[PDB]
Amino acid sequence: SGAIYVGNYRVVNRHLATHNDWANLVWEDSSRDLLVSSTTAQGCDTIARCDCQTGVYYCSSRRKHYPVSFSKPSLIFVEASEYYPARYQSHLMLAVGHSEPGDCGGILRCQHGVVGIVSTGGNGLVGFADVRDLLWLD
Numbered sequence: 001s002g003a004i005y006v007g008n009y010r011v012v013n014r015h016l017a018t019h020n021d022w023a024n025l026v027w028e029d030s031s032r033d034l035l036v037s038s039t040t041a042q043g044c045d046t047i048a049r050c051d052c053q054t055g056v057y058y059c060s061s062r063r064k065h066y067p068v069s070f071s072k073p074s075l076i077f078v079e080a081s082e083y084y085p086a087r088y089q090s091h092l093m094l095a096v097g098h099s100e101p102g103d104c105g106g107i108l109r110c111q112h113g114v115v116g117i118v119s120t121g122g123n124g125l126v127g128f129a130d131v132r133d134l135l136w137l138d
């Protein structure tokens with residue numbers, strides 16, 4: 001679990017969005033596993049606007065942060081799950097690192113700000129949904 005709080009927006013994994021996120025829907029994209037909802041309170045976070053390929057992510061299944069080298073956002077095949085059919089997820093970045101299903105929502109940050117959130121993983125890999133291209137969040 002986890003979310004990004006920027007301005008009057010809350011960014012979460014689309015597959016983990018609550019009834020309240022859907023009732024205050026701003027934008028969603030199944031192909032990116034992202035959903036953005038509106039908030040009444042002003043958020044705590046700032047978004048990176050950069051091309052960093054190194055950063056640090058929070059891994060809830062280890063209660064720890066780990067440094068990572070990650071690939072550029074791209075279209076990656078993701079096997080079927082209880083949440084989505086087998087499909088290509090876009091704007092996804094992969095890295096070598098530990099992750100388990102409940103780790104989705106953990107923030108990936110570089111020196112410039114928030115880069116994205118954990119969205120996929122398995123077998124020593126961790127995948128992050130990029131948010132740096134969503135300029136309207138600012």
Ligand SMILES: C=Cc1cccc(CC(=O)N2CCC[C@H](C(N)=O)C2)n1
Pocket residue numbers: 015033078081083084089099100101102103104119120121122123
């Ligand atoms: C087994 C490790 C692991 C680590 C991290 C996450 C997962 C689960 C996973 O990747 N899913 C299920 C939820 C929706 C995801 C998607 N973006 O399509 C795909 N599994």
Ligand SMILES: [Zn+2]
Pocket residue numbers: 048049050051052110111112113
């Ligand atoms: Zn950066």
